[PDB]
Amino acid sequence: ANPYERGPDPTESSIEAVRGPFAVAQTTVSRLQADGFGGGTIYYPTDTSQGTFGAVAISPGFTAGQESIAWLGPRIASQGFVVITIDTITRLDQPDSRGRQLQAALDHLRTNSVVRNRIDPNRMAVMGHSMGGGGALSAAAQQTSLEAAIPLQGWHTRKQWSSVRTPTLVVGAELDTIAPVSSHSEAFYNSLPSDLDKAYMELRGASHTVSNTPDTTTAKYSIAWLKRFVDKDLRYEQFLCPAPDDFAISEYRSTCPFHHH
Ligand SMILES: [Cl-]
């Protein structure tokens, strides 16, 4: 039995839900309290009876505040994760710096008095929008123990990601003119190792801002990816393999079936 499974057996509806099965609470990390990042909000399940949970850090993009990705916090955490949505040190920080800040936010959770006993510090993930998604890739390249990475309309000058060993879901926006998929998202996906567990999901008709307000497709597949890889939860592979049929997805590529033990 997989000791990391949390919550009831899933359905398409359960992964689409705005609130998942876990009631959540939150705590604020002030900029002063944060070492190596700009502060954030931690969302976490209050129920401890199923065990500890994986941890996820989420970064905004260039010029943007935490508020641009805040909706992801409770939507993911309520599926059984401890999630920190960060501010960066400055809004004009570059991608590799954002990756260091994502790692610093995860490291902060290890000693945070509200959540340190609620996390499994060995099961961590990174996500981010725009340069924050470039940051997520950067963090994975620097810390191969990360269990998942999810760049949302990622932006990075570095196009080569052959060193990544963290299962990665690359989410592109079809009509993105800021981080166009041909030069950013698709290039990142094509340079990830061919033997990595990975997927590329392009959002039909979407602009760069699709991640900045609730988007069910983004949420549902982020949830499924984090479950599958942070929790090793094979109940969630059904949503990822074979290719999803959602209207909102204009293209899907993957290395299905994914590896497991
Ligand atoms: Cl755009």
Author numbering: 2 to 262
Cite, word for word, the article reporting this structure.
Plastic pollution has become a global environmental challenge, driving interest in enzymatic polyethylene terephthalate (PET) recycling by using polyester hydrolases. Metagenome-derived polyester hydrolases, such as LCC and PHL7, have garnered significant attention due to their high activity at elevated temperatures of up to 70 °C. Their engineering led to the development of optimized variants, including LCCICCG, LCC-A2, Turbo-PETase, and PHL7mut3. , PHL7mut3 has been designed to improve the activity and thermostability of PHL7 by the Q175E, L210T, and D233 K mutations. In this study, the PHL7 wild-type enzyme and the improved PHL7 triple mutant PHL7mut3 were expressed in E. coli and P. pastoris, and their PET-degrading activity under various conditions as well as their thermal stability was assessed. Both the PHL7 and the PHL7mut3 sequences contain three putative N-glycosylation sites (N143, N144, and N161). To assess the impact of mutations and glycosylation on structural folding, we used X-ray crystallography to determine the structures of PHL7mut3, expressed in both E. coli (E_PHL7mut3) and P. pastoris (P_PHL7mut3), as well as a non-glycosylated variant with three additional mutations (P_PHL7mut3_ng), also expressed in P. pastoris.
